[PDB]
């Protein structure tokens, strides 16, 4: 049904916290910007700690209906490897989401500027699979797994972020149909507009493992259309140099990059894979980070 901007604002008000967090947040500084809106750091008045605030204009969205997803779905879900969402507010024509500020930057900076060893890759995969196993069990699909969506803490812990595209499946609605994600990381069934479940996150995770091995996802040198035709039509993508990757990591990757969704490994199955025996403590991540390179 056609609804006014003001009707939409009233509907979104029902699922956010009342009032304006400028009562307890000051010294806002813009640090990032997307198609969605901007990301600010602010100082909390009681503790003096830094928090992140995502600001999204209700009038400047491709699909404004998508503003409900993260604030509704992730409200009551919490995990040590998922970025903490504290609260959401409507401030004028903007949705504000107040979240943990992780000060270790994104995994993208690491994979673009260093060669991760298999211990470090195993460390990232263990943390992300713990997050995905928890989320998938609740029927949550992230739908935008990639290095940019993975944030590091100052002490080298790994958290899944950027839940803007997330969805929830149930017994009555077991599949999603929406075209969402990032071209190079999209599962073939997403590109083909087939009904899908949590399996799409395991494909995307496979592509992120190729980022950690090769520095870029497959076909990243090609335009998105050309890349997505290859993902849709071609055999699963391979690493640049099979002889530089262990048999256990190739086996791990082989369970994720499976075209038939029902034959793809689950997060729970991958948690038991011997590759994750190479996982190390947060201190094995710290040396990769921009500050210490």
């Amino acid at each position: 049904m056609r609804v006014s901007h003001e009707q939409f604002r009233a509907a979104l008000q029902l699922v956010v916290s009342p009032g304006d967090p400028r009562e307890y947040l000051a010294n806002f500084i813009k640090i990032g910007e997307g198609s969605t809106g901007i990301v600010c750091i602010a100082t909390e008045k009681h503790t003096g700690k830094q928090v992140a605030v995502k600001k999204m204009d209700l009038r400047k969205q491709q699909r404004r209906e998508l503003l409900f997803n993260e604030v509704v779905i992730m409200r009551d879900y919490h995990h040590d490897n998922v970025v903490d969402m504290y609260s959401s507010y409507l401030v004028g024509d903007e949705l504000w989401v107040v979240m943990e500020f992780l000060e270790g930057g994104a995994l993208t900076d690491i994979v673009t500027h260093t060669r991760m060893n298999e211990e470090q890759i195993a460390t990232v995969c263990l943390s992300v699979l713990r997050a995905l196993s928890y989320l998938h069990n609740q029927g949550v699909i992230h739908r935008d797994i990639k290095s940019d969506s993975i944030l590091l803490t100052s002490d080298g812990r790994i958290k899944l972020s950027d839940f803007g595209f997330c969805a929830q499946v149930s017994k009555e609605v077991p599949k999603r149909k929406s075209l969402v994600g990032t071209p190079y990381w999209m599962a073939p069934e997403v590109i083909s507009r087939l009904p899908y479940g949590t399996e799409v996150d395991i494909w995307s995770l496979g592509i992120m493992v190729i980022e950690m091995i090769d520095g870029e996802p497959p076909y990243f040198n090609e335009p998105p259309l050309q890349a997505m035709r290859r993902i849709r039509d071609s055999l699963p993508p391979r690493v640049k140099d099979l002889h530089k990757v262990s048999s256990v990591l190739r086996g791990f990757l082989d369970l994720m990059l499976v075209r038939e969704p029902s034959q793809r490994a689950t997060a729970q199955e991958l948690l038991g894979h011997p590759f994750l025996k190479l996982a190390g403590p947060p201190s094995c991540i710290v040396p990769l980070m921009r500050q210490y390179r």
């Binding site: 491709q62 699909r63 929406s178 075209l179 969402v180 994600g181 071209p183 999209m186 590109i191 083909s192 507009r193 335009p223 998105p224 259309l225 997505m228 035709r229 849709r232």
Partner: protein
């Protein structure tokens, strides 16, 4: 490039309605496909070089066509819009 020729014909028709012109389509010469949207639906920009007859004489034109589709281009688009049409 059959799907392309239909987009090129649409571009010529839209130009003729816009400028009260009477250009007669001949053929697509070259075509660039560019994805510009991949959330909710596919949005593709086509950059077409096409031959059309003006007053009976075959001339070359560059057309920019914006299409939305549920499936990867060049599947049946639910929206088409001429953005640019000029002689080369």
């Amino acid at each position: 490039s059959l799907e392309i020729e239909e987009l090129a014909r649409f571009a010529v028709d839209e130009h003729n309605k816009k400028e009260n012109a009477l250009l007669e389509f001949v053929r697509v010469v070259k075509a660039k496909e560019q994805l510009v949207g991949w959330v909710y639906e596919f949005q593709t920009m086509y950059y077409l070089t096409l031959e059309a007859k003006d007053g009976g004489k075959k001339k070359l034109y560059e057309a920019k066509v914006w299409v939305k589709s549920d499936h990867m281009p060049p599947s049946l688009p639910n929206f088409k819009e001429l953005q640019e049409f000029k002689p080369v």
